[PDB]
Amino acid sequence: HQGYSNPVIPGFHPDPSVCKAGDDYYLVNSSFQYFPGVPLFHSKDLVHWEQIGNCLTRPSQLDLTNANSGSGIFAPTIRYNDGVFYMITTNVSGKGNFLVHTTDPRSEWSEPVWLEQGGIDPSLYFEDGKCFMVSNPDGYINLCEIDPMTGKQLSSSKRIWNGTGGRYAEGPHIYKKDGWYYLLISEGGTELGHKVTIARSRYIDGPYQGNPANPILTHANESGQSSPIQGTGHADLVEGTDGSWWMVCLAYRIMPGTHHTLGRETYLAPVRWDKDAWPVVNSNGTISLKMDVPTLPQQEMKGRPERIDFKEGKLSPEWIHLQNPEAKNYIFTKDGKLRLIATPVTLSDWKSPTFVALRQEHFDMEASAPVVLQKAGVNDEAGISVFMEFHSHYDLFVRQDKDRKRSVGLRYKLGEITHYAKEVSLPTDGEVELVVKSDINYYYFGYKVNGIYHDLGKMNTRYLSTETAGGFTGVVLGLYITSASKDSKAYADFEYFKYKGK
Ligand SMILES: OC[C@@H]1O/C(=N\O)[C@H](O)[C@H]1O
């Protein structure tokens, strides 16, 4: 009933949108180049969230050809109306705006319903048996009516607002309260200038008048400059079960030199919203890591296991691939290991490698996995990659050398640099466990064989940040295999994946 920590969903979980279905809450994030797309969460208290799945789970729903950290799936919105869940988003690597729907969030969602109105950050609002769509073509918030089942546009598009004057007006959502249509948007861009602004009108099609107190949430001003959280924005308003008001929003945690590697994460703020009043977010339009505020009655949810095993023969919803995966290269063995089949595709090829990953969700963490490389030709490799983008990733691996010898290598890919930090000869018997640790300053790398851990050294975190590497995503930790030899049938088995955050 009192207090929680932010972020409520750590690591790469940007552009949160939430809906209330009775006493249940469901939340979606943008996923960019990753498959499956649009992670889908469930909560009873807005604080604790369980990933129950992903909205885009089949190739027919999600074409990621040539997608990267700056393309693919952008901000999604989730809405619940009359027993139907709708998820509306943009695929910028494909045909643009669309939605999918379902009556059961845990089931397979529909095929895409492609939409006419352009721009990005589409969102839906329902009233009087009608479905209204907003998005942001040419920087203007546009409104139209749609049939959400057929995707047919039923009214002409109208420009309803263009924000307070701040840059990159996006994330529009309409709500109705106290006889006003409230239009909430993001301005300022998704870096340090991020802010949430709100306008209202007696008519859904305007004219909209801005809140004199805008912005309603931002760390861009003097009041936020010292905060370890920056870039607060892309909010979605939601009602508590007790009639209180809340918002989910994105933000990030800054690192030295103004860097962030954990992506934009999902944050929660309380909102005061009196009858006939404008909303005020957490008193002064800021949020904190420790939120000492009343909450809905709290219920803990299932999280990521400290040791993930593959005995069940199914990866949980948390696991993500680069672009559209070659599904036959990920298999589960008789003794319950993850088996990854090699292809020649490296992690720098801008195509889908045999690569599957979990988001890094803590500054201080340790992750590890045993690696059993088999049927390998010379220079075939398998291991763990600390991955931001095809041009920005640190790779720790077991490599097949000549004469049945093997080694552990550590390779840093940064633009035109491909730097071999270490190449260490292995003992011919002994299962190798590869180990990646981190703190806010460095990744540390090592390996364990025959009960002895060996340090392979460290590398700065800043080179994998969004500020350095570009794009819209966060660091992921991936298991991978790449062949580089004539006619290779190499594969590698991974018995578990350990992840523990401090
Ligand atoms: O990518 C175009 C805009 O740039 C931004 N921030 O820098 C906004 O979030 C995008 O809408």
Side-chain angles (χ1 to χ4, degrees), residues 397-399 401 406-409 424-428 430-432 434 447-449 454:
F397 55 84
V398 172
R399 189 179 64 212
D401 303 327
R406 293 183 166 191
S407 50
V408 182
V424 179
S425 192
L426 282 167
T428 54
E431 181 169 277
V432 177
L434 295 178
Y447 68 100
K448 188 173 205 194
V449 61
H454 304 83

Side-chain angles (χ1 to χ4, degrees), residues 15 70 74 120-121 136 167-171 186-191 194 234 250 264 472:
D15 305 316
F74 280 14
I120 64 158
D121 296 6
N136 74 338
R167 65 170 49 203
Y168 299 136
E170 69 192 341
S186 278
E187 294 171 35
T190 193
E191 311 82 26
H194 221 176
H234 211 102
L250 77 76
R264 302 164 293 160
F472 287 127

Side-chain angles (χ1 to χ4, degrees), residues 32 35 56 58-67 72-73 91-95 114 323-324:
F32 301 91
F35 189 89
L56 313 177
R58 306 184 306 284
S60 69
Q61 295 172 308
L62 180 44
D63 179 5
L64 291 164
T65 305
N66 309 130
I73 297 291
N91 185 355
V92 307
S93 303
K95 296 199 286 169
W114 295 103
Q323 308 175 345
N324 298 108

